[PDB]
Design a protein around this ligand. Structure first.
Ligand SMILES: N=C1NC(=O)/C(=C/c2ccc(-c3ccc(S(N)(=O)=O)cc3)o2)S1
Lengths: 296, 258
């Protein structure tokens, strides 16, 4: 553990502190997750078992690279490639002008590729949110934080319900469905897509029911026509207020017809109808995609 | 049919070759033997039942065990310990509510301390270099089941049963990849129940002909005939329950005709 000079706290993760650090010997800049063991209760958290073991499989340029695991007596450190900052801080710093459209298109393309690789390697990320997306100076964005990820089966079976950060959580999880798969990650990306366009979180609720209503109020309250089976889901209530679906050019004004189309496909109530990461890359919204450099 | 079915399958075929224990590992183990491993795995079954764990966890455990023993010498008194930290790491990886460490201490009848299981957990991790997302006979079985005309549940449970027998006997089964054993278990179930054979769709999907599955069928057939005489019976007793449609009570076919 002694080749590293820690520079500062950079982040919190869902399961441990992250630092910027440098290799005294190679000069290499890195990020260090500290995962706290404290020894005699439960040992190494399932959280870390999953993250390390999935991340080792998931080598792709749109996924953070795990360089090393320092597996001490008292602590576990995951050593990652250092990336300049998160999409979150990038968005906050771009609130008044907004991120250039060609940059959004690029970030979305790149993210979709990262997600495609994940899903094709049987992994759900389950915590796609802007402070988990990492951006460098050369125009790249990478999925990070796999502490909440898992390997899914074909077919799936019931997974953990306490899943995905509220603002980004898909309706099928909100409404208490038995089964969810890859579509939960697409929904999250949809919200993120929208956030880059509007500079405001799309569905910023403060409780499960508040979240539900924020989705309903924008996309229309779901019914059997739009989502066969909604009305018989465990946490569906006939007493949910019935709001009309708002027009996309009001929801997400700066988008052209192609962006709206793609967004509407990512944000479909029916997980079975929701577009896949792989199919999305074929979307005509990406016919003219480039690699712009972020105005840091 | 799910969105990434073909893709995931191709990928598991790449991974099953990387997640391999060396075949003749038991030959270089000074103190433990195949029949001991057999006692161990059998026990792990008993444990999965008691704690209502997924069959996939059992399979992950066995894979960790075979990989760990492939590179560490283990004395008989420590064998259970390796299996216990395997099972515990399989649980943590694959289950929603893994049992707690105190529950793993408990079913060793207090042979080992909590302090130990946690140290063994650490070591097992160290030895497998944190590589736990291993393909199992089980993953391929489910994947194969989707190509079923139509969904016979008896065939399913029986294939699951046959694949689970494969876990107990390192000789011969370590010879085979999970996909191959899966293929074998599937055709053998299908036949036994309905007379039908390993279908055209899977031949296209896996590249596997009845002819390439033959050596494994030959062995798996044997195992299946000798199943009630076998020293370890935990699987037979498990697959007697209604949950599994009592498939372990069906009569194997006399010949496989191939
Ligand atoms: N939750 C996480 N999971 C990871 O793998 C992480 C690795 C990582 C690399 C770089 C960063 C990183 C995170 C946040 C910033 S920030 N607060 O925008 O300056 C800057 C860099 O995190 S963070």
């Amino acid at each position: 553990m002694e080749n590293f000079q820690k520079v500062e706290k950079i982040g919190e993760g869902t399961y441990g502190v992250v630092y910027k650090a440098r290799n005294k010997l190679t000069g290499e800049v890195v990020a260090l997750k500290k995962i706290r063991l404290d020894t005699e209760t439960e040992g190494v958290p399932s959280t870390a078992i999953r993250e390390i073991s999935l991340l080792k499989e998931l080598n792709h340029p749109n996924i953070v690279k795990l360089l090393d695991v320092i597996h001490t007596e008292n602590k576990l450190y995951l050593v990652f490639e250092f990336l300049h900052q998160d999409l979150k801080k990038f968005m906050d710093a771009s609130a008044l002008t907004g991120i250039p459209l060609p940059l959004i298109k690029s970030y979305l393309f790149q993210l979709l590729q990262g997600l495609a690789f994940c899903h094709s390697h049987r992994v759900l990320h389950r915590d796609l949110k802007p402070q988990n997306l990492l951006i460098n100076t050369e125009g790249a964005i990478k999925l990070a934080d796999f502490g909440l990820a898992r390997a899914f089966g074909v077919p799936v079976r019931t997974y953990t319900h306490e899943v995905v950060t509220l603002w980004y959580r898909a309706p099928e999880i909100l409404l208490g469905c038995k089964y969810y798969s890859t579509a939960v990650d697409i929904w999250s990306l949809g919200c993120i897509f929208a956030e880059m366009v509007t500079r405001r979180a799309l569905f910023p609720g403060d409780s499960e029911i508040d979240q539900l209503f924020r989705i309903f109020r924008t996309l229309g309250t779901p019914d059997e026509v739009v989502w066969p089976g909604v009305t018989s889901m465990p946490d569906y209530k006939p007493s949910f207020p019935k709001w009309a679906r708002q027009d996309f050019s009001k929801v997400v004004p700066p988008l052209d017809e192609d962006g709206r189309s793609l967004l509407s496909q990512m944000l479909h109530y029916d997980p079975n109808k929701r577009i896949s990461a792989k199919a999305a890359l074929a979307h005509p919204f990406f016919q003219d995609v480039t690699k712009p450099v972020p105005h840091l | 049919v799910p969105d990434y079915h073909e893709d995931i399958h191709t990928y598991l075929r790449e991974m099953e070759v990387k997640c391999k224990p060396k075949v003749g590992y038991m030959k270089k183990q000074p103190d433990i033997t195949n029949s001991m491993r057999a006692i161990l795995v059998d026990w792990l079954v008993e444990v999965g039942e008691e704690y209502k764990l997924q069959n996939e966890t059992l399979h992950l455990a066995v894979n960790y065990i075979d990989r760990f023993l492939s590179s560490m010498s283990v004395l008989r008194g420590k064998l259970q310990l390796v299996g216990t930290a395997a099972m515990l790491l399989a649980s943590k990886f694959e289950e929603i509510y893994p049992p707690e460490v105190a529950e793993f201490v408990y079913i060793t009848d207090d042979t080992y301390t909590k302090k130990q299981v946690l140290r063994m957990e650490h070591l097992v991790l160290k030895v497998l270099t944190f590589d736990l997302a291993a393909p199992t006979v089980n993953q391929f079985l489910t994947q194969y089941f989707l190509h079923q005309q139509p969904a016979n549940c008896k065939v399913e449970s029986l294939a699951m049963f046959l694949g689970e027998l494969s876990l107990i006997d390192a000789d011969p089964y370590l010879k085979y990849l999970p996909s191959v054993i899966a293929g074998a278990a599937f055709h053998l179930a299908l036949y036994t129940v309905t007379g039908q054979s390993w279908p055209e769709s899977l031949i296209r999907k896996t590249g596997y002909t009845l002819e390439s599955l033959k050596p494994c069928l030959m062995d798996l057939h044997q195992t299946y005939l000798k199943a009630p005489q076998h020293a370890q019976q935990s699987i037979r007793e498990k697959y007697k329950n209604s949950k599994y449609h009592g498939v372990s009570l069906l009569n194997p076919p006399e010949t496989l005709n191939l």
